[PDB]
């Protein structure tokens with residue numbers, strides 16, 4: 001209730017602008033999809049929301065793949081990010097790798113996209 005109050009509004013901008021990595025923000029998963037990988041473990045890319053912004057530049061550490069494959073981490077769930085790393089590509093784009101996270105509320109217990117977040121412009 002006041003659902004957006006459940007999310008760390010402003011965390012996406014803090015990660016991408018300030019380079020803040022000590023925060024443990026609470027974010028909503030909007031979408032998850034596999035990337036094209038070949039002969040190596042699958043890799044998942046996530047569209048995440050902090051209630052104000054969405055950002056599609058997240059990938060999951062492969063050690064967390066079971067959370068996706070066993071359906072605990074899925075679209076609409078709310079999770080707390082306990083550890084993440086930022087990397088920057090040759091072309092300037094930043095990628096956030098999610099290393100440790102906790103699902104606070106399952107997709108089924110939330111059920112909808114929270115608020116009206118808008119895409120973050122890098």
Ligand SMILES: O=C(O)c1cc(-c2ccc(CNC(=S)c3ccc(-c4ccc(C(=O)O)o4)cc3)cc2)n(-c2ccc(Cl)c(Cl)c2)n1
Nearest residue numbers: 035036045056057058059060061062063087093094095097
């Ligand atoms: O096949 C595809 O569709 C497809 C493909 C990619 C795409 C794929 C790869 C890279 C480069 N590899 C980077 S950044 C990377 C990957 C893993 C790690 C890492 C550290 C620790 C761990 C772990 O434990 O698993 O993993 C650190 C850096 C860029 C892009 N993308 C893609 C393009 C743009 C963005 Cl912003 C994002 Cl997040 C993904 N789409």
